[PDB]
Short mmCIF file of all heavy atoms in Angstrom, two decimals:
data_model
loop_
_atom_site.label_atom_id
_atom_site.label_comp_id
_atom_site.label_asym_id
_atom_site.label_seq_id
_atom_site.Cartn_x
_atom_site.Cartn_y
_atom_site.Cartn_z
N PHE A 395 -9.36 18.93 -5.24
CA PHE A 395 -10.36 17.90 -5.02
C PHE A 395 -11.74 18.16 -5.74
O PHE A 395 -12.61 17.28 -5.71
N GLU A 396 -11.97 19.36 -6.38
CA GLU A 396 -13.12 19.41 -7.31
C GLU A 396 -13.03 18.33 -8.38
O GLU A 396 -14.06 17.78 -8.77
N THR A 397 -11.82 18.00 -8.86
CA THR A 397 -11.74 16.78 -9.68
C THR A 397 -11.92 15.51 -8.85
O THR A 397 -12.64 14.60 -9.28
N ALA A 398 -11.27 15.41 -7.67
CA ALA A 398 -11.49 14.25 -6.81
C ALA A 398 -12.96 13.86 -6.79
O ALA A 398 -13.32 12.71 -7.04
N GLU A 399 -13.82 14.86 -6.56
CA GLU A 399 -15.25 14.66 -6.48
C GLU A 399 -15.80 14.02 -7.74
O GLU A 399 -16.50 13.01 -7.69
N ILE A 400 -15.45 14.57 -8.91
CA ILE A 400 -15.85 13.92 -10.16
C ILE A 400 -15.39 12.48 -10.17
O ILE A 400 -16.14 11.58 -10.55
N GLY A 401 -14.15 12.22 -9.76
CA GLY A 401 -13.60 10.88 -9.75
C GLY A 401 -14.43 9.88 -8.96
O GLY A 401 -14.84 8.84 -9.49
N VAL A 402 -14.71 10.19 -7.69
CA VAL A 402 -15.50 9.28 -6.87
C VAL A 402 -16.94 9.19 -7.35
O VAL A 402 -17.61 8.17 -7.15
N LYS A 403 -17.43 10.25 -8.00
CA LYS A 403 -18.69 10.14 -8.70
C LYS A 403 -18.61 9.08 -9.81
O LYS A 403 -19.49 8.22 -9.93
N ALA A 404 -17.52 9.13 -10.59
CA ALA A 404 -17.28 8.12 -11.62
C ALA A 404 -17.25 6.73 -11.03
O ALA A 404 -17.74 5.77 -11.64
N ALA A 405 -16.67 6.59 -9.83
CA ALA A 405 -16.67 5.29 -9.17
C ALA A 405 -18.10 4.87 -8.83
O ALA A 405 -18.45 3.70 -8.98
N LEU A 406 -18.94 5.82 -8.42
CA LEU A 406 -20.29 5.37 -8.04
C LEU A 406 -21.16 5.08 -9.26
O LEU A 406 -22.05 4.22 -9.17
N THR A 407 -20.95 5.72 -10.43
CA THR A 407 -21.71 5.20 -11.57
C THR A 407 -21.31 3.76 -11.89
O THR A 407 -22.11 3.01 -12.46
N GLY A 408 -20.08 3.37 -11.54
CA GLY A 408 -19.55 2.04 -11.75
C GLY A 408 -18.42 1.96 -12.76
O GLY A 408 -18.19 0.88 -13.32
N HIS A 409 -17.75 3.06 -13.05
CA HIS A 409 -16.51 2.96 -13.80
C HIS A 409 -15.43 2.34 -12.93
O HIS A 409 -15.54 2.24 -11.71
N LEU A 410 -14.33 1.94 -13.59
CA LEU A 410 -13.09 1.56 -12.93
C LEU A 410 -12.19 2.78 -12.91
O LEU A 410 -11.53 3.09 -13.90
N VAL A 411 -12.08 3.41 -11.76
CA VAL A 411 -11.26 4.60 -11.62
C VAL A 411 -10.00 4.24 -10.84
O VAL A 411 -9.98 3.30 -10.02
N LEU A 412 -8.92 4.95 -11.15
CA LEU A 412 -7.64 4.74 -10.49
C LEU A 412 -6.93 6.07 -10.39
O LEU A 412 -7.05 6.92 -11.30
N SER A 413 -6.20 6.27 -9.30
CA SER A 413 -5.46 7.53 -9.19
C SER A 413 -4.43 7.42 -8.08
O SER A 413 -4.29 6.39 -7.42
N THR A 414 -3.69 8.52 -7.90
CA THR A 414 -2.60 8.64 -6.96
C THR A 414 -2.90 9.73 -5.95
O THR A 414 -3.63 10.69 -6.26
N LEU A 415 -2.36 9.60 -4.74
CA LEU A 415 -2.57 10.62 -3.71
C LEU A 415 -1.35 10.70 -2.80
O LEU A 415 -0.84 9.68 -2.35
N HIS A 416 -0.95 11.94 -2.49
CA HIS A 416 0.21 12.17 -1.62
C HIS A 416 -0.22 12.05 -0.16
O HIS A 416 -0.85 12.96 0.38
N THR A 417 0.21 10.97 0.50
CA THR A 417 -0.10 10.75 1.90
C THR A 417 0.57 9.46 2.36
O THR A 417 0.95 8.62 1.55
N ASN A 418 0.64 9.29 3.68
CA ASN A 418 1.46 8.24 4.26
C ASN A 418 0.68 7.18 5.04
O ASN A 418 1.26 6.14 5.38
N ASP A 419 -0.59 7.41 5.37
CA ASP A 419 -1.42 6.40 6.01
C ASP A 419 -2.87 6.83 5.84
O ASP A 419 -3.20 7.62 4.94
N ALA A 420 -3.73 6.28 6.69
CA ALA A 420 -5.17 6.40 6.50
C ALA A 420 -5.71 7.75 6.93
O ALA A 420 -6.61 8.25 6.24
N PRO A 421 -5.23 8.39 8.00
CA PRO A 421 -5.80 9.72 8.29
C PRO A 421 -5.19 10.67 7.28
O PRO A 421 -5.87 11.60 6.83
N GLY A 422 -3.92 10.44 6.90
CA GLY A 422 -3.34 11.19 5.82
C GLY A 422 -4.25 11.31 4.61
O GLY A 422 -4.69 12.40 4.26
N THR A 423 -4.55 10.17 3.95
CA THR A 423 -5.47 10.24 2.82
C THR A 423 -6.82 10.75 3.24
O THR A 423 -7.20 11.83 2.86
N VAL A 424 -7.56 9.98 4.05
CA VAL A 424 -8.96 10.35 4.27
C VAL A 424 -9.08 11.84 4.57
O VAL A 424 -9.82 12.55 3.89
N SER A 425 -8.33 12.33 5.57
CA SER A 425 -8.18 13.78 5.78
C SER A 425 -7.97 14.51 4.47
O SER A 425 -8.78 15.35 4.05
N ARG A 426 -6.87 14.16 3.80
CA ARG A 426 -6.59 14.75 2.51
C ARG A 426 -7.77 14.63 1.57
O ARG A 426 -7.97 15.54 0.84
N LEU A 427 -8.54 13.55 1.53
CA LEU A 427 -9.59 13.45 0.52
C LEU A 427 -10.81 14.26 0.93
O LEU A 427 -11.47 14.87 0.07
N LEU A 428 -11.14 14.25 2.21
CA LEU A 428 -12.35 14.89 2.70
C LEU A 428 -12.24 16.40 2.70
O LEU A 428 -13.26 17.08 2.75
N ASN A 429 -11.03 16.96 2.64
CA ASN A 429 -10.96 18.41 2.77
C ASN A 429 -11.33 19.34 1.57
O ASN A 429 -11.31 20.55 1.85
N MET A 430 -11.73 18.82 0.40
CA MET A 430 -12.49 19.62 -0.57
C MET A 430 -13.90 19.08 -0.84
O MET A 430 -14.50 19.38 -1.87
N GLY A 431 -14.42 18.28 0.09
CA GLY A 431 -15.86 18.03 0.20
C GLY A 431 -16.46 16.68 -0.26
O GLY A 431 -17.70 16.49 -0.20
N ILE A 432 -15.65 15.75 -0.74
CA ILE A 432 -16.13 14.37 -0.81
C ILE A 432 -16.12 13.83 0.61
O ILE A 432 -15.18 14.09 1.37
N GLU A 433 -17.21 13.11 0.98
CA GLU A 433 -17.47 12.32 2.18
C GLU A 433 -16.79 10.97 2.06
O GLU A 433 -16.52 10.51 0.94
N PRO A 434 -16.51 10.32 3.18
CA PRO A 434 -15.98 8.97 3.10
C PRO A 434 -17.06 8.00 2.70
O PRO A 434 -16.68 6.91 2.28
N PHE A 435 -18.35 8.31 2.77
CA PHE A 435 -19.24 7.34 2.16
C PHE A 435 -18.99 7.30 0.65
O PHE A 435 -19.04 6.23 0.04
N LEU A 436 -18.78 8.45 0.03
CA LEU A 436 -18.66 8.39 -1.41
C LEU A 436 -17.29 7.81 -1.80
O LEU A 436 -17.20 6.80 -2.50
N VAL A 437 -16.19 8.36 -1.25
CA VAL A 437 -14.89 7.79 -1.57
C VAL A 437 -14.75 6.36 -1.00
O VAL A 437 -14.71 5.40 -1.76
N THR A 438 -14.66 6.22 0.33
CA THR A 438 -14.52 4.88 0.94
C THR A 438 -15.63 3.92 0.52
O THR A 438 -15.43 2.70 0.47
N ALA A 439 -16.82 4.44 0.25
CA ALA A 439 -17.84 3.46 -0.10
C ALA A 439 -17.65 2.96 -1.51
O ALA A 439 -17.90 1.79 -1.81
#
């Protein structure tokens, strides 16, 4: 998720970012995304 972080940063500058994630529902991902230090404001926002 050190890259994840760059990715959601790219989303906040306003690029069109797209990617894949291994998970089966919403706590799956969000949990999965938040555990190397992106916040849900940055990703979900």
